[PDB]
Write a protein that binds this ligand. Structure first.
Ligand code: DZ9
Ligand code: CA
Ligand code: CA
Ligand code: CA
Lengths: 189, 189
């Protein structure tokens, strides 16, 4: 009966956009906590740069360390290459039979839910939480919860480009993440 | 091989945002045509409304009628249930052996490509075209083509809330589609 949120992604890098979404859902739905679920990234086909699991995990640590109700879930990182959400949620529900998982997704992704691997069985494992801007209404045959979220146009691709151009990203992600990015020379070609 | 774009989605309703994306990719990559690929929607779990196949197809016709280089592909819509993209593209590849398919996806979708059903096999059937805001880049282990398109922010979920509130959506989607929506009482739920 414990209400726990799940927010998945590569977190490459983690930013205030992610934290804002996790916080809003935590508060809207009265969750006990939100788990950040870092995805595996397959090796690059052409051997080009991917952000190491080590780096993504430490940025997540730094991003969430000051937040009481945010935790990191290592389930997806703990085996294989990438996992279907079904596979991950199967293991978490078996592992935490007392938890009601609330799986947070962007509004734009809602229309594509019928294409998710093994969707019908996943619907028995999680409650989906669709996030949408004020003024936006989500539509789906599936029983999802909608949460309205403020606009802050920060994205990982934005931040990556700023670091490439040796610009600062003050005010866009936690200070400690920024220091890590700068010290490890991340995202600079 | 003929270069053909694929833009998939529920188009519920189709609007200027979709046409802008298709058109930009069409011009950027010198495609012969862009085929809009309407998805199937499973029946509502709680007996509520989904927009019919008939309605979605006719809005799509009205949205694309003026453009020679825009067509509608019925591969998914003619089926009884939803299709994985891999299964659709395998059939299309089979049916059109001289076509190189360019599969258009939103920038936000790129991060989650490793979770798509049969992604490795699908990579051998299509070239993905990711849409980035101008000056921004997409990060993925997969070989993808990037097309820059401004984020125009018009969305189906905005238009639907507007129709529920009994507003017009003039200047946000083709005139003909707005008429069809109003005349048929779509999006009032
Ligand atoms: N299979 C998935 C998606 C998908 O099929 N998208 C899509 C996008 C454009 C056209 C299309 F046919 C499908 S979006 C998505 N998001 C996720 C997420 C994982 C964690 C947060 S969202 C997992 C799987 C998929
Ligand atoms: Ca730097
Ligand atoms: Ca009406
Ligand atoms: Ca009515």
């Amino acid at each position: 009966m414990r209400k726990i949120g799940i927010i998945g992604g590569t977190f490459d890098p983690p930013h205030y956009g992610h934290l804002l979404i996790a916080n809003e859902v935590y508060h809207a739905l009265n969750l006990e906590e939100v788990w950040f679920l870092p995805n595996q990234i397959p090796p690059h086909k052409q051997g080009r740069n991917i952000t190491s699991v080590e780096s993504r995990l430490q940025m997540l640590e730094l991003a969430t360390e000051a937040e009481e109700h945010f935790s990191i879930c290592l389930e997806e990182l703990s085996r294989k290459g990438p996992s279907y959400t079904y596979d991950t949620m199967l293991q978490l529900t078996k592992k935490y039979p007392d938890v009601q998982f609330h799986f947070i997704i962007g509004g734009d992704m809602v229309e594509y839910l019928p294409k998710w691997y093994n969707i019908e069985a996943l619907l028995d494992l999680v409650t989906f939480v669709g996030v949408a801007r004020p003024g936006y209404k989500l539509r789906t045959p599936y029983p999802i919860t909608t949460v309205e979220i403020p606009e802050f146009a920060v994205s990982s691709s934005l931040l990556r480009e700023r670091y490439k151009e040796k610009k600062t990203c003050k005010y866009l992600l936690p200070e400690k993440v920024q220091v890590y990015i700068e010290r490890n020379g991340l995202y600079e070609s």
